[PDB]
């Protein structure tokens, strides 16, 4: 990479297909998850806050409590365990 900032190489994953453009529905920005629940991590291009580092887009972690309104999701980056601060807006229940 010519630079190493967080949004480097994210042109695709952090952009919306023209039609999904605009403010997102509130329903999923308010979803409540319970500790232990498996959730898929995907940043919503339309929601600025509550995001995590783009590298984790695609992960499927486990909710293990929260911080403020955001959730604390445990994931394993390669062989390393990490905890990710992320709001529901960028989460979907597995299954």
């Amino acid at each position: 990479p010519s630079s190493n900032g967080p949004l480097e190489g994210t042109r695709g994953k952090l952009k919306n297909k023209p039609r999904d453009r605009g403010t997102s529905p509130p329903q999923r920005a308010v979803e409540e998850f319970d500790d232990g629940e498996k959730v898929h991590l995907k940043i919503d291009p339309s929601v600025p806050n509550g995001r995590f580092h783009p590298r984790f887009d695609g992960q499927t972690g486990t909710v293990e409590g929260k911080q403020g309104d955001a959730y604390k999701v445990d994931i394993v980056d390669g062989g390393k365990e990490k905890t990710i601060i992320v709001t529901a807006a960028h989460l979907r229940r597995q299954e």
Binding site: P18, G22, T23, P25, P26, V30, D69
Partner: protein
Amino acid sequence: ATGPRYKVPMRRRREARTDYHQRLRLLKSGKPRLVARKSNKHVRAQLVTLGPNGDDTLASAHSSDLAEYGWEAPTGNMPSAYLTGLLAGLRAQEAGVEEAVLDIGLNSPTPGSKVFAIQEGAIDAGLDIPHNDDVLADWQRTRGAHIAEYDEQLEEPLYSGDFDAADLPEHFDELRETLLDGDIEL
């Protein structure tokens, strides 16, 4: 509309019925919304909660089902508003609901307006709702004092159908009195 790339607003935004930016701030309290809506001849008050497939209304009141308790007056004014809120609040209280946040939809937060009235009644029913007393109308205008004093400048009855001549804010007191009683059929 125009092409594959065209963006169509959410249905309820097309219909200009739901302010989604507000709906979000609203849902954040995690409490039930006290939906206060108006009509030319009526005033509605619903207690809504979130649901897997849409909102759930746990308890509501309509100015039309007010008469069912004695209301013989019109149904699109302050006294009517307060009362409709109170009734809903009571049913709400019955349903097991205790707190709520005021969702006034696309209405304006004008001081003393009817939504706030709907909020006052609901509050008086024993429901906890974040509010601001000095944004509510003074007790009298709630009773309908402003209307009576308007019929005072009579010369012609303010009311077509025969419901008093100088009007009766008392009927309001009588109706509130009725609701506040613990025998009423909710």
